[PDB]
Design an enzyme around this catalytic site. Sequence first.
Site, PDB file in Angstrom:
ATOM      1  CD  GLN B  62      -2.881   0.376   2.553  1.00 58.38           C
ATOM      2  OE1 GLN B  62      -3.274  -0.290   3.494  1.00 58.38           O
ATOM      3  NE2 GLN B  62      -3.218   1.615   3.146  1.00 58.38           N
ATOM      4  CG  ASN B 101     -11.590   1.960   1.189  1.00 60.04           C
ATOM      5  OD1 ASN B 101     -12.262   1.871   1.673  1.00 60.04           O
ATOM      6  ND2 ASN B 101     -11.699   1.432  -0.011  1.00 60.04           N
ATOM      7  CG  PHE B 112      -4.378  -2.250  -2.026  1.00 59.87           C
ATOM      8  CD1 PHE B 112      -6.088  -1.121  -2.187  1.00 59.87           C
ATOM      9  CD2 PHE B 112      -5.249  -3.743  -1.896  1.00 59.87           C
ATOM     10  CE1 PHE B 112      -7.049  -1.626  -1.646  1.00 59.87           C
ATOM     11  CE2 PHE B 112      -5.504  -4.192  -2.321  1.00 59.87           C
ATOM     12  CZ  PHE B 112      -7.378  -3.307  -2.457  1.00 59.87           C
TER      13      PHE B 112
END
Lengths: 6, 164
Positions: B62, B101, B112
């Site tokens: 991420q 999110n 990610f």
Amino acid sequence: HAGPIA
Amino acid sequence: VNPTVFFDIAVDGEPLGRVSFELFADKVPKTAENFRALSTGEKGFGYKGSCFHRIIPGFMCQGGDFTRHNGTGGKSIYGEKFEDENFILKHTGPGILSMANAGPNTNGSQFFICTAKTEWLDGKHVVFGKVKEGMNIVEAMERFGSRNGKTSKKITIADCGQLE
């Protein structure tokens, strides 16, 4: 806080 | 019709390898365009220089937090936070690029890159792209992570822009 789980 | 952007990844300053992405313009034009404008810096800001703050081996990598660099920042081009365009594309396997999110209708700049099939995120996270070349360079950033997200060395997006 952002970021997907599992 | 599908914009193609890329990330030149670096581990501790050292450039690791390149990783290109397809921005699925036809299925996700609002979300993929965001990544496109964020990748270019033609909006004034974006991913260049940012890091992959959260890398969990076998799960995903991420990044996208170019404001606070940790999960609490980042700001889309439609302002600061846009609604999830749709959930048409599933997290079918490694390479899938999806939006990171913080609770439905909160897409900003975080994203990610999947390093495994993450079907559970289907419907919860907007899939908008996928690793074209260098999915082995994303499997390279895999090792420098851990169960909890925390990375060993500093995985960064050295440069970024559009190629096609």
